[PDB]
């Protein structure tokens, strides 16, 4: 089942997040979800079983309190530290994608989070809504590391 993540009908990936792993990894990457250090650490220590070595990136919100975001905790399950070799680049359009002002502002500046941007295995925009994780579409996350 490692050599058959792809179906030979079309070439799309067939083994991805089923209908409850999407909506779990969407409430994390919701734009108004902010974690401090002790809650990120507990969140970051359930994706493994206390074996993988993480190194914490510097947090987003910094002056009033120390706050991370729900994408810096999701850009750690791709490249957890320097010794892991995964570094990817991907530009994908979500399931809804309400369009911006359509001539000046580019595809990233949608009204919602919209178009997803990842550069060097850090999420820069967009959410995870079955267009970037799940089945069907050729440009998913799990297709790129494969």
């Amino acid at each position: 089942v490692k050599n058959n993540l792809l179906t030979p009908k079309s070439g799309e990936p067939i083994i991805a997040a089923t209908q409850d792993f999407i909506t779990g990894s969407y409430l994390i990457s919701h734009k108004d979800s902010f974690y401090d250090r002790a809650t990120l650490t507990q969140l970051l220590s359930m994706m493994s079983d206390g074996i993988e070595h993480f190194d914490i990136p510097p947090p987003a919100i910094m002056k009033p309190y120390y706050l991370w975001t729900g994408k810096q905790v999701f850009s750690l399950l791709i490249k957890p530290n320097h010794n892991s070799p995964v570094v990817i680049n991907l530009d994908a359009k979500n399931k809804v994608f309400v369009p911006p002002k359509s001539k000046s502002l580019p595809n990233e500046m949608s009204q919602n989070d919209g178009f997803v941007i990842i550069r060097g295995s850090q999420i820069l925009s967009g959410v995870m809504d079955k267009s970037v994780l799940g089945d069907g579409k050729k440009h998913s996350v799990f297709y790129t590391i494969l």
């Binding site: 070439g11 680049n89 991907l90 530009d91 550069r119 790129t144």
Partner: protein, 146 residues
């Protein structure tokens, strides 16, 4: 195979090549120079394809595409023409940028003359931190694209 039944995905493979070999300490190149770094690799790739005629020997260098000596392959020979023309459509974008940004955009290469006209010293230092600050292409970033 990647999207639309071609095994390339020229967009993502460029942006994967651009992040993995990114630096600002390296210099960068000029629009005429990057095509010869491209033709250095896939140059010798094409002359391995010999284009014999229907009877053993070679055919004359005039009127190759005549729908009559199409041998055991043409799409692999047509594959390198599309990898050249993708960079050619991006070779002009640097030139047509640096044209309208004040400098002379030398898409055409110079001949046996004063080698290194080098318009660095001519235009002021605002222009060198104008074009290369927006976007830029190393010689490493074309060795790792193709």
């Amino acid at each position: 195979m990647e999207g639309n039944a071609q095994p390339v995905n020229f967009n993502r493979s460029w942006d994967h090549a651009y992040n993995i070999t990114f630096n600002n300490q390296d210099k960068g190149l000029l629009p005429y120079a990057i095509m010869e770094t491209a033709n250095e690799i896939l140059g010798p790739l094409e002359e391995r394809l010999v284009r014999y005629d229907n009877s053993g020997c070679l055919v004359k260098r005039e009127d190759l595409n005549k729908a009559e000596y199409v041998d055991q392959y043409d799409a692999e020979r047509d594959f390198y023409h599309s990898l050249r023309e993708y960079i050619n459509g991006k070779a002009t974008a640097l030139a047509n940028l640096r044209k309208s940004r004040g400098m002379l955009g030398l898409l055409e290469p110079p001949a046996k003359e004063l080698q290194g006209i080098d318009p660095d010293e001519t235009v002021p230092d605002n222009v060198k931190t104008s074009v290369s600050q927006l976007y830029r292409i190393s010689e490493k970033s074309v060795r790792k694209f193709l």
